[PDB]
Structures are given as C-alpha cells and as structure tokens.
Amino acid sequence: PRNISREESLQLEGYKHACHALLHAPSQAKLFDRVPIRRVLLMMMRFDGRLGFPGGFVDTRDISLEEGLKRELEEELGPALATVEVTEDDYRSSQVREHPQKCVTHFYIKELKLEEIERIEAEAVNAKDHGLEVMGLIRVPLYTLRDRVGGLPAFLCNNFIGNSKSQLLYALRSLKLLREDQIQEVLKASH
Amino acid sequence: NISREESLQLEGYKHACHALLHAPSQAKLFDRVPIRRVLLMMMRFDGRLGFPGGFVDTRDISLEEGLKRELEEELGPALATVEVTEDDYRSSQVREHPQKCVTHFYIKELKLEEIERIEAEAVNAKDHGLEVMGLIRVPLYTLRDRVGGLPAFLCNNFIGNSKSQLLYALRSLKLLREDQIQEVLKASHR
C-alpha cells in the first residue's frame, strides 16, 4: 500500500478506483456518565465479515470520484445521504498498489451535525444494501477504559478490510483525536 | 460448561443472560449466495462483538425478567413485545479467573419483520451509542475465496465465550454440521 497524490493517480491508466468515506460528528455524551464519547465515527460490518468504511468502486472514465462515492454511499448507507454533499474539499488521501490487482483507493473524511449522523443510522436499515453488502452500521470507540484494553485498543483487534485500519488511524491523527504517542500506545495495548 | 438449577443457587457468583435472536431469510447476496438466516449480534462499547443482554441479580426477579429488561435496554422499545420465555433457555457456562460468572445463553426464533423492526428502532434504545455501538448480522455463508463471510467473521474480537456460544447456535439450529464448523475455523485460524 503506497501513497500517491490525487492528480497523479487520476492520470494513471488501467487502474481500478475505489472511494470510501469516514462520516463523523462531535458528541457531548459520556459512556457510564463518566467516559466521554467525544465524537461519533461510523464504520460497518461488510458482507465478508470484515469492518470497513462505506464506499466502493468508481469508474472514472464514466463519472467523477465524488459522483461515484455519492452513489455508493446512498446504496450502502441509505436515503439520508441525499441530503449529504461529499465534495472535493472532503478528499484526504489516495493509496495505490499493483498486487494482487492494480488498485487505487481514495479516502474522504466529512464532518456532519450529530443529528445528521443519527438520521443516517436510523435510515441505514432502508438502504438498498442493508443485510446484503452492509451487515450493520457501527460506531468506533475512541476511549481506552480503565483496564487499559477495552475501547479503541480492543476494537483495533477486529478484522479489517484492505487498508481501512490504516485509514482510521490516519483520521484519528488528522482530526487531532489522539497524539502519535497515544496512537502508538493503543497499538501496543492491542498487541 | 454447567447446569441451570445447579447454577442458579451457587454462592456469590454473578449472573448474566444473553440471547441470539434470529429469523429465516429468502434473501440472496449477489443474487447467488443465500443468507439462509438473519442472526443478530452487536458491537459493544468495549470494542468487542457480543449478543445483547447483561447482568441480572439472581435474587431480584427471574432469569427471564433480567434478560427481557437488558434486551429492551440494549435493543430498544420494540422488545417489550418480545417474549423470551423459559422455553428459550439453552445453556450456562461457569468461569472463575475473571469475576466468577455464570453466563446463560438463550436462542429465540422470531419472524423476519420483527428482526427488521428491531434493527429499525435499535437507534432509539436507551443504550444506543453507549453500551451498544451498533447491531450487525452474522454472515453464515462462505465466499468463493473460501475465507470471506463466516470464517473471516470469526477472526473478529469477541467478548467472553461469545464465539463459543455462536458456534453452539449454528449446530443448535442445524445450520452447519460439525465438520463444516471445523472447516470454517481452520480457514478462520489461518
């Protein structure tokens, strides 16, 4: 999994493209009324039994990266996304590979209002892809519990698709949620 | 393992109840792979997968009344009308080095629409976004690559003897035979 710029990857020939987004919102809620949730981050159980971000393959000879993302989000997350514009401003990074297959993955990150996230969750059951490609929506625990494992560390022990584990860790950094040491720490507690 | 009447009068041990709710399904994945059955589990606040339910004080209302409560709390209001009776009981396990606990497992077949209504109102549960970070369905099939679906699913991080219990259910409901179950774990483990 290699880093590459948007413009450079879009000039490539014979590559498959995918788009995936992290939809997130701040929250004041405290787990057990003591542990702050801080922010809601959405991921999913996929048909293949792995955790992933919503999104999928985009044909760039046909539609833009944003256009492809939009369609796949509405299919996977549901009608509530018709009110949700993920634009070029939301674009973050692009990784490329040639093995097993020549594949470029794009990652977006988009902040929403809490009630937006909540509407998305409420309406996900009505998605075309519910109970098929998408087996359920999930929130990422951002805290470590007193036992030093429960929460994010333990969650990172789940089974992730492609580079999704790495994209999330990037977002944790990008959104200033965890310091590099906190991130390294979480990864150790995870074993 | 353990036993029900042997378990319910221990001494000091803490008691928990969890349930697998499931329904038959005609749906097919890529218009190819049958779903067969919809089985509910969840992502917990601690980052692990588990069944809904929780602790129930043995002296404070029956094992079923503990469960039904923890169900409405975690899965939501829809459950008030779910009837998780004594006949829905299935097993108990004893542990010690952890907290000394008795886990009671319950399997109850519902109608699909009922599962659908449970997933749809789950976002209204007292514990949505607190104890319960989201419901999921258990993929029962195995993909052409012979890893995706259930075997990949068993590599996720499960609480307690949650995995154990699920394997039990799959045999309990004649969903997979013992060798098929073994095939799945051998694919899973690697």
Ligand SMILES: [Mn+2]
């Ligand atoms: Mn997808």
Ligand SMILES: [Mn+2]
């Ligand atoms: Mn898709």
Ligand SMILES: [Mn+2]
């Ligand atoms: Mn409880």
Ligand SMILES: [Mn+2]
């Ligand atoms: Mn509970």
Ligand SMILES: [Mn+2]
């Ligand atoms: Mn619980």
